[PDB]
Structure formats: structure tokens, C-alpha cells
Amino acid sequence: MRAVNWNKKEDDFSLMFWKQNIAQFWTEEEIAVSSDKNTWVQLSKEEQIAYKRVLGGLTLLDTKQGGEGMPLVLVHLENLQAKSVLAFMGAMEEVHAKSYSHIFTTLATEEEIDEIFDWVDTHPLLEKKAGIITSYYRRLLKPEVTKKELYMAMVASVFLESYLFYSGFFYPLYLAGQGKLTASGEIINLIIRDESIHGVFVGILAQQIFAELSAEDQQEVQKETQELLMELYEIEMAYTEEIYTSIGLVEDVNRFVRYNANKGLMNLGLEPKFEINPIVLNGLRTDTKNHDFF
Amino acid sequence: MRAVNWNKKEDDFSLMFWKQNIAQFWTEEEIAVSSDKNTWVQLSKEEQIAYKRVLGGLTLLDTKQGGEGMPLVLVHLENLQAKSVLAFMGAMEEVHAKSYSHIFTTLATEEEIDEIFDWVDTHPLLEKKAGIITSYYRRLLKPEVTKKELYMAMVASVFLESYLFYSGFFYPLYLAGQGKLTASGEIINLIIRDESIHGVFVGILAQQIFAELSAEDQQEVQKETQELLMELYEIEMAYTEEIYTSIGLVEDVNRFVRYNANKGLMNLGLEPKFEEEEINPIVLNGLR
Ligand SMILES: [Cl-]
Numbered sequence: 001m002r003a004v005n006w007n008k009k010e011d012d013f014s015l016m017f018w019k020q021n022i023a024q025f026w027t028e029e030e031i032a033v034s035s036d037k038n039t040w041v042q043l044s045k046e047e048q049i050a051y052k053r054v055l056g057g058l059t060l061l062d063t064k065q066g067g068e069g070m071p072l073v074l075v076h077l078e079n080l081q082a083k084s085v086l087a088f089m090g091a092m093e094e095v096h097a098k099s100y101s102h103i104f105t106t107l108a109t110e111e112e113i114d115e116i117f118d119w120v121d122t123h124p125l126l127e128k129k130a131g132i133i134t135s136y137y138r139r140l141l142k143p144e145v146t147k148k149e150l151y152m153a154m155v156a157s158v159f160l161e162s163y164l165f166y167s168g169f170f171y172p173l174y175l176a177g178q179g180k181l182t183a184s185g186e187i188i189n190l191i192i193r194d195e196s197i198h199g200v201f202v203g204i205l206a207q208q209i210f211a212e213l214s215a216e217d218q219q220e221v222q223k224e225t226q227e228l229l230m231e232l233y234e235i236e237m238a239y240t241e242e243i244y245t246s247i248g249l250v251e252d253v254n255r256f257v258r259y260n261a262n263k264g265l266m267n268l269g270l271e272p273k274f275e276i277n278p279i280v281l282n283g284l285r286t287d288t289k290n291h292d293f294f
Numbered sequence: 295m296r297a298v299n300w301n302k303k304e305d306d307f308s309l310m311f312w313k314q315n316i317a318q319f320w321t322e323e324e325i326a327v328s329s330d331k332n333t334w335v336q337l338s339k340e341e342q343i344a345y346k347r348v349l350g351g352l353t354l355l356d357t358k359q360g361g362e363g364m365p366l367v368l369v370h371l372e373n374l375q376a377k378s379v380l381a382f383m384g385a386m387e388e389v390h391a392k393s394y395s396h397i398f399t400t401l402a403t404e405e406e407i408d409e410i411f412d413w414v415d416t417h418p419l420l421e422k423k424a425g426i427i428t429s430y431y432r433r434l435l436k437p438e439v440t441k442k443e444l445y446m447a448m449v450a451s452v453f454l455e456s457y458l459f460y461s462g463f464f465y466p467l468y469l470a471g472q473g474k475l476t477a478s479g480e481i482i483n484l485i486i487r488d489e490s491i492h493g494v495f496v497g498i499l500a501q502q503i504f505a506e507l508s509a510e511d512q513q514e515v516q517k518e519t520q521e522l523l524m525e526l527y528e529i530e531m532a533y534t535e536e537i538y539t540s541i542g543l544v545e546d547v548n549r550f551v552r553y554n555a556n557k558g559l560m561n562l563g564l565e566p567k568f569e570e571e572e573i574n575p576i577v578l579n580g581l582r
Contacts, residue, residue: 001358001415001420003350003357003391004357005395005407007395007398008407018392022323025321059297060295066377066378067377068369070365070381072369075361075365075366080361083388084360087361087384088385091384092385094378097298097378098312117297120295130295138437141435141437142436
């Protein structure tokens with residue numbers, strides 16, 4: 001039975017991503033959020049509700065990625081060095097989720113927070129969105145998986161990390177780019193810096209598996225991938241209408257969703273399928289690599 | 295579908311263990327090991343081989359715990375706060391494995407290191423003991439698991455983290471207690487500080503799942519747990535004989551194995567099964 005041996009590279013990139021994930025390590029206690037209250041109270045009722053709801057949705061996606069996606073993808077990987085990186089990435093998803101709770105504690109009452117998490121649990125679009133992704137993960141709950149099944153779980157992972165978060169990330173970035181809730185904006189930037197490298201790494205692993213598939217299986221997963229992309233897009237368009245219509249931002253968020261869907265495709269080695277709001281860009285500007293990335 | 299909500303406690307202990315695991319965070323780059331070369335070269339070849347072999351075995355157990363044990367136990371937990379803790383613990387198992395490679399790079403040539411890992415992969419006792427543990431994990435590769443299956447995977451996890459490591463941890467602690475390889479000894483101590491809290495936490499979870507079983511299921515897993523303990527003991531005694539006979543420490547390591555088996559049992563809420571003894575005082579000084 002093999003032990004991970006870092007003296008003998010198993011691939012050309014796992015060490016670099018291990019080191020970068022470690023270098024980017026942070027926890028919920030490094031960014032104090034209390035100073036955001038001065039601009040929180042200046043938001044309208046409708047803007048506060050949108051902010052809290054998008055944070056709830058972001059929390060759900062991190063919960064599923066750290067607790068189902070990374071574990072089930074990594075257990076079936078044969079590359080022990082890449083397994084190591086994914087295990088660390090899954091732990092950082094849990095750090096991300098906990099950081100949203102830290103934001104909530106500062107900006108909302110105990111009762112308001114619990115109302116948001118009840119709204120998340122019963123929300124039909126969030127349940128549909130997360131169910132679509134996790135179906136590909138739950139297919140891996142068996143002793144032996146095919147490369148097609150593993151590939152499609154990695155696709156789902158890239159789409160969650162590079163794409164599905166961004167209808168939610170929009171709003172903390174939009175406010176921060178206006179000087180509002182900048183400390184929470186710093187946290188979201190740290191989260192984005194991690195998710196960006198997560199999506200690149202899983203996308204590399206997916207491309208390696210894809211090349212190992214038969215031509216017939218390649219054509220089948222290409223179709224499934226394009227269908228999944230658009231299935232999620234339909235749900236995201238319903239979600240942006242639900243969240244952002246009250247505050248006038250639906251079309252802006254949709255452009256941002258498409259931008260990040262294209263990024264997810266590129267992480268998988270695929271061409272863009274869709275043809276960034278400047279205030280969002282300014283809210284990314286606090287992190288040099290985020291602003292360059294986007 | 296539920297998102298983790300740390301505002302509303304799911305149990306009385308996950309937040310405390312979350313905070314402690316974060317507080318204990320460290321990586322491979324924080325302890326420079328090159329100063330150990332001065333005492334490494336004073337060891338005989340037999341001592342050096344034993345050290346490298348036991349680190350190879352420790353690396354195998356971390357590989358399986360981070361890459362199979364924690365993932366498969368956590369995926370079936372309903373408690374999202376406890377899931378969070380386990381995901382972090384699994385990542386730290388991978389950090390531990392990477393730290394052993396850091397020690398290897400300092401103390402051995404590239405060819406020597408690859409020889410150790412080939413020795414690990416083809417070792418029959420390491421394959422057997424790892425296979426016994428991972429059999430309980432692999433039973434969780436299905437959409438729905440029973441609480442009996444989850445309990446026995448948690449038992450296997452506590453036995454690995456609180457017990458099976460210690461036939462290997464012995465020798466770095468013993469040498470460090472004598473002033474030898476003390477930088478590597480500092481790393482092993484950081485690893486032990488993590489594994490100790492891992493075993494306590496998983497043991498708490500196991501006791502919770504146990505209380506949720508029918509009496510019939512309780513009687514079954516109680517017996518399976520005692521049998522597993524002693525099946526692993528028989529393998530560990532073969533392993534200590536193989537590793538430590540050359541350097542005269544077999545009976546010393548066996549005492550330490552029994553001590554830590556008892557700790558694993560107590561982490562599960564179970565009574566000790568081996569003669570309760572004082573820890574070897576040289577090892578105690580290596581923990582100091
Ligand atoms: Cl296949």
C-alpha cells in the first residue's frame with residue numbers, strides 16, 4: 001500500500017499548488033469586521049436583505065464543497081500528492097464558511113442570522129443548484145468509479161468554485177468598490193483568491209483525466225459538461241432575478257455570472273460560451289492578483 | 295439543503311475543537327532540520343534504518359487517514375460543525391505526511407528515500423495493518439451507511455490516531471529524549487499534539503453514535519471493537535519485532551504500544567485492557 005512520497009514528483013504541478021495553498025492560509029480571526037457597521041447601517045432594508053441572502057447562499061456552496069465535493073473527488077484520485085492538495089483545499093472551504101458566520105455575527109442579530117439559515121435550507125433555487133452539483137459527487141459513493149464519473153465530478157467542482165459562487169460574490173465586491181463594507185470585502189477577496197486557485201487546480205486534474213478517456217467517453221462528457229453549464233446558467237438567471245431585482249442590479253450580475261462561467265470553462269481547457277462591472281473591479285482592486293485575474 | 299451555521303451550536307464541543315485545531319496550525323517549513331545532521335551521523339546504520347523505516351510507516355498511516363479516513367467519515371456525518379473539524383484534521387494529516395518528507399530530504403539521499411518508500415509499499419505487515427483499518431473506511435463507499443458502520447469507522451480512526459502511530463513515534467521520541475535528532479523530534483511532537491486532539495475528538499463523536507444504536511447493535515460493535523484492538527495488537531507485536539530487534543528495543547516499544555492502546559480505548563469511553571504502566575522515562579524526556 002503506497003505512502004505519499006514528495007521526493008518523487010507524481011505530476012508537474014501539485015507541489016506548486018500545495019505551497020501556494022499553504023502560503024495563502026488565513027483564518028476567520030485575522031480580519032476584524034466591526035468597522036463595517038458604520039456603512040452597514042447606511043444600506044437600505046432591501047440592500048441589507050440582499051447582502052445577507054447572498055452570504056447564506058455562499059455558505060451553502062462552501063458547506064457542500066468542503067463536506068462532499070473535495071472528500072469524494074480526492075478519495076478516488078490515485079495521485080497521492082494531488083490528494084494532499086485537495087484535502088487542504090477542502091479544509092479551506094470550511095474556513096471560508098466559518099468566515100461568513102463571523103461577518104453575520106457582526107452585522108445581524110442572533111435571530112436574524114437563524115432566519116437567514118432557515119431561508120437557505122428551504123430555498124428552492126438554492127436547493128436545486130446545490131442538488132445538481134452534489135449529484136455528481138454522490139455518484140462517487142461506491143468502491144470503484146469510472147474516469148467519466150470522476151471527470152464529471154471535477155467539472156462540477158470547477159463550476160461550483162469558478163462560476164456558481166459569483167452571483168453571490170458580486171454584491172460584497174460591488175459594495176466594497178464603493179467604500180461600503182470594506183472589511184467584509186477584504187474577507188471575500190481572500191476567499192476569491194483561494195477559490196481561484198482551487199478552480200485552476202481541479203481544472204488541470206480534469207484535463208489530465210479527460211485525455212485518458214476513450215473518444216466515445218470524451219464526446220459524452222463534453223456534451224454533459226455543456227449541458228451542465230447551461231442547466232446551472234438557467235438556475236443562476238432565476239436566482240439573480242430573485243435576489244437583485246429589488247436593488248436594480250440583475251443585468252449587471254448576469255454579465256458577471258457569464259464572465260465567470262467563461263473562466264470556469266477556460267479552467268477545463270474549453271472555449272468560452274458567453275459573449276466586469278467597473279465598481280466590482282474596484283472592489284477586487286484591494287487584492288492585486290484578484291484585480292489582475294479579473 | 296442546509297448550510298453550516300456557527301451561530302447555532304450543533305453540539306457542545308465542535309467549536310472548541312475547531313478553534314484548537316486552528317490554533318495549533320503549523321507547516322513543514324517552520325522547523326529547520328539541518329542541525330540534526332550532527333547527531334544523525336553518530337547513529338549506526340541499524341539505528342538509521344530503523345528511524346527511516348518507522349517514518350515510512352508513519353507516512354503511510356497519515357496518507358490513509360487524510361486521504362480515506364477523514365473524508366469518508368466526514369461525508370456521512372449529519373453534524374456540519376463536526377464535519378468542518380474533521381475536514382481540517384484531514385488536511386493536517388497531509389501536512390504531517392509532508393513534514394516527514396522534509397525530514398527525509400535532510401537526512402537521506404534521493405535514492406535512499408525512494409528505497410524506503412518501495413519498502414513501505416511492499417511491506418506485508420504495513421499492508422495488513424493499513425488494510426484492516428481502511429476496510430472500515432471503504433465500507434462507507436455507498437450512498438447510505440448504518441450507524442454501526444459509521445461507528446466502526448470512527449473506532450478504526452481512533453485506533454489509528456491514538457494507537458497505531460505509536461510503535462513508530464516511539465523511536466523519534468526515544469532519540470530526542472537522549473539529545474539526538476531533536477529538531478525532527480520537535481516536528482514529531484507537533485504531530486503528536488495534533489493526533490492527540492484528533493483522537494479525543496473522533497472518540498467523542500464515536501461515543502455519540504454509540505449511544506444512538508440499538509442494544510443489539512451496541513453488543514455487536516462492542517465485541518468487534520475489542521477484537522479489532524487485539525487483532526491490531528498481534529500485528530503491532532510482529533512489527534515491533536521486525537523493526538526494533540536489530541537495535542534492542544522490542545520490549546520497550548511494546549510497553550509504549552500498550553500504553554497508547556489504553557489511551558485510544560479511553561478516548562472511546564472504554565476501559566483500559568492492558569496493564570497500566572509508567573511511560574518509558576527516556577521517551578517522556580523526548581516529549582518534554
Ligand atoms: Cl475508466
